Amino acid sequence: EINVIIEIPMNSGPIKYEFDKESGALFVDRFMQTTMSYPCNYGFIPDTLSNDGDPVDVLVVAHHPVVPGSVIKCRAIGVLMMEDESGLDEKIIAVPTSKLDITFDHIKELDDLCEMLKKRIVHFFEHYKDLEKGKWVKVTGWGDKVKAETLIKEGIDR
Amino acid sequence: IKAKANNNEINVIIEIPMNSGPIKYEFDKESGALFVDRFMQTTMSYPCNYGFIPDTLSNDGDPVDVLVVAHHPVVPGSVIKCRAIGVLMMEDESGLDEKIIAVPTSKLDITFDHIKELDDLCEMLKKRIVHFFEHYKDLEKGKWVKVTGWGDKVKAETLIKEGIDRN
Amino acid sequence: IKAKANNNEINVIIEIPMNSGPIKYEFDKESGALFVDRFMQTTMSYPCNYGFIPDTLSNDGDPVDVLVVAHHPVVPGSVIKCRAIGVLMMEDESGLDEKIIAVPTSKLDITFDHIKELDDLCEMLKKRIVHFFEHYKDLEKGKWVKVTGWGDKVKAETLIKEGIDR
Amino acid sequence: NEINVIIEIPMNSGPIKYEFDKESGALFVDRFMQTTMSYPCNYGFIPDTLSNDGDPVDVLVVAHHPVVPGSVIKCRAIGVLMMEDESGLDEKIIAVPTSKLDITFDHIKELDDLCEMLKKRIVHFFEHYKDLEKGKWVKVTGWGDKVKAETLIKEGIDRN
Amino acid sequence: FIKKIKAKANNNEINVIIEIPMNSGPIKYEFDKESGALFVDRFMQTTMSYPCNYGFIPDTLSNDGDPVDVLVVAHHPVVPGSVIKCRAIGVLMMEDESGLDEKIIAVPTSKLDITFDHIKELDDLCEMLKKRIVHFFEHYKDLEKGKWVKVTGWGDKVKAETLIKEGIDR
Amino acid sequence: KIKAKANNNEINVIIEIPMNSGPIKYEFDKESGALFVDRFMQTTMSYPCNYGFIPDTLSNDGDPVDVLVVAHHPVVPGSVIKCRAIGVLMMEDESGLDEKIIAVPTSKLDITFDHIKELDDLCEMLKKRIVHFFEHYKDLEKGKWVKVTGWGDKVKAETLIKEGIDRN
């Protein structure tokens, strides 16, 4: 079980929020220029640090959006691997715990996710900065659960 | 935030907005974080803005909770200054449960001015409320709720006092 | 509009979108006007898109109605091409009522392709639908509903062939 | 004594001012409203009626919730709102849903039965919603009786 | 109603029947001009929504037997089935898998929204909005197998009115 | 405690009330840092812009300098927009004098405001809509009135902000 603070709710529209850690305020990072909304609730695991000096970020697949700033207890089921202009980028894929939503209980690996959801997610990431000057993403592959858990542990320990 | 404002008004912190669908939020009393308690499974949403009175303590070990009857939803984590007008009494699988029923103060909304007692609320609204609590956990294993009655304004004020004094 | 879209597909005109609040709409066959039936008094919303099959006739004189399981709501009056996968069987105060359960054809949403019967639906969702039907009329006097069970696809195809044949 | 009202503009909806084309039966965008105001009530008209201005009799339907544009609410008139604008007198029936549709309005028999604040909010909307249209304005002169509304209704059905 | 509505609201102006609102969800609606029924064409599979209000001019026939299409650039979404009177300012030009496709770019008439009065040619539209429209059309079929779209370029107002006239005369 | 200025001409603005957001009039309580419901507003009017204030500022009314952020979309309450001041909306109510800074997002947030550097660059109807809002949003609150007395320019705005920063 990991705690994930949500920055950006699924299907929310053009606003790209980001938490300032120095203050804990939610800042507007960007007013997004495409017609794309985030495919998943999106946030981070508090008290963790990626090698990029930032927290471990997370896509929480849920059936519903959630107010920015709310926390979802989830479990990691995988990892989405990307490289952006700032280099390499990994995002955990997680789902609510069976206390929050029992209907995800049979979802144990990426394998168990809708294929189309997964493609929607790649398509989103590969395109949502297209109209952002000086910015881009490439999706190089996926990791499994064991891979997700090691990322988290390394990020807690860092 | 204190349990009470002026003129015997209470501060109530909103966890869940009225008619707001399936997310059941709850504030972590420790860290002050807004947590997702559940993604609720029925097709019901709360009939009221729902929250708690800060700086209070129930026998259950949590803040006195409150249903705010209002004409409009409010973002979660926002604070409505209200007057208590009653109590909803329940029993669930784990014991007794009471919820204050409050309305906004006339300074937030003058249209509630003439609502001083429970008998002043919409009759359907009151049944909507009981219906909500008696059924919204039906798809949750082992959970039940039964409304056993209502208390009056004094009853509420006493509950609130005890909650304050108990902190 | 014809009831049938292909061999094993139906047209369904949506009156009430999934998760859409208190408004309960019903189309007036005569006028073809969409009327407000009631403002519902519980905190329940439709657990999915709900409508009927144009050009069909139930044993009750009304058309054959369907709950269309979908990923999203649809505007009332709009028409979804589906395939029947089952049926929900109920009784209310006015006796028997059954509803076809359907999913969008795979042309409209391929994520539904692998759902061919009721048992391929989310168990919670099925539980959600029943719970709704069993309680959404609770605060309306002299009104009630009990779910007596489900029928399978064959059973649904037969209710549709009937209502067309009638 | 019950009326069918086809709704053009749902309470609290954005800026889109819809207008029924009687010719075609289509829903036209009359205006993208320039102010920050939203309709205070669901608004439309009674089919197969006909007012002095040669337009259908139009109705504000006080309800607790919005309805999609084009849908029809069975209602019963309780009063009339009387106005004049840059073009003369305008009057609007105030109706509430039948008790079949919403039993919570059962006790609403006259205008006096309405929230004073709703009545005020209505007046203000009308007096102000066209402020940013050049040359246009509205002033509310007063309110009519339920018999005034029925009369009005009677007259629009007959005029038709 | 699709039959009772004229294609031109007068000399400047076209009646456009909206099928899909701006910034609307995944639902891709299409009027069937047989029955005038609104059909769900598809539940779109990407995270994209339409960047403007989308519909067609009644009483027109494109070369391909459909009506003439219009993206109505507007400040706000309208309800599907509703009609807006606009005036054309351009056309967008592309190629999908099934050949050529041009769509008319229009704005409301100044009677509907006077804030559009100074918008006369494409050059007057926000550049980011134009890029956003292109982007949309180039990508919103990406998850639909065998489906593709390239944007060829833009036509001017004269091109647009030529398109309208033709479709009318056709 | 968020900085007033994100840098030498940009300001941080904490949003209380989203554009087009309905009847809820929120107000942050400084002492608690809690988002309070101030009013359930009684007319059918919504805010024309995202509205809030600059932290760490203090006006003469003993409240922080408050801002209308013209933007294409509402943003959640409590969220912070980085912007740049382009003018001042100058008014009087029953309490006396009042000024609201008019800001737009920085070009990092939204490049489409890039070309908007003075009030005359704004849609005239938008400006008409903002004035109308303020001059009527309180008509149904007894005793309350507002008169828009005019507009200030960027220099003016930028002075107000400077003073509000120095005064805090």
Swiss-Prot record, chain D:
Residues binding Mg(2+) 2 are D58
- Highest taxon of source: Bacteria
Provide a GO biological process annotation.
phosphate-containing compound metabolic process
Q: Is rRNA processing one of the keywords?
A: no
Which amino acids does the record list as binding Mg(2+) 1? D53, D58, D90
Please tell me one Gene Ontology term that the record gives under cellular component: cytoplasm
Q: What is its main location?
A: cytoplasm
Instruction: Cite the InterPro entries for this sequence.
Output: Pyrophosphatase (IPR008162), Pyrophosphatase_sf (IPR036649)
Keywords in alphabetical order, please.
Cytoplasm, Hydrolase, Magnesium, Metal-binding
> What are the binding positions for substrate in this chain?
K17, R31, Y43, Y129
Reaction(s) this enzyme catalyzes, per UniProt? diphosphate + H2O = 2 phosphate + H(+)
Q: State its location(s).
A: Cytoplasm
This protein's cofactor list reads: Mg(2+)
Q: Which Pfam families match?
A: Pyrophosphatase (PF00719)
GO: which molecular function terms? Answer: inorganic diphosphate phosphatase activity; magnesium ion binding
Q: What is its EC number?
A: 3.6.1.1
| Family, as annotated | Belongs to the PPase family.
What is the protein's quaternary organization? Homohexamer.
Q: What does this protein do?
A: Catalyzes the hydrolysis of inorganic pyrophosphate (PPi) forming two phosphate ions.
This chain belongs to the protein called Inorganic pyrophosphatase
| Source species | Rickettsia prowazekii (strain Madrid E)
Q: Which gene encodes it?
A: ppa
UniProtKB/Swiss-Prot annotation, chain F:
Q: List the PROSITE patterns hit by this protein, alphabetically.
A: PPASE (PS00387)
**InterPro entries reported for this sequence:** Pyrophosphatase (IPR008162), Pyrophosphatase_sf (IPR036649)
Can you tell me which residues bind Mg(2+) 1? D61, D66, D98
Q: Which CDD domains match?
A: pyrophosphatase
User: Which cofactor is essential here?
Assistant: Mg(2+)
Coarsely, its chief localization is cytoplasm
Spell out the subunit comment. Homohexamer.
Q: Describe the family membership recorded for this protein in Swiss-Prot or TrEMBL.
A: Belongs to the PPase family.
How is this protein named in the record? Inorganic pyrophosphatase
Q: Which organism is it from?
A: Rickettsia prowazekii (strain Madrid E)
Q: What is the lineage of its organism?
A: Bacteria, Pseudomonadati, Pseudomonadota, Alphaproteobacteria, Rickettsiales
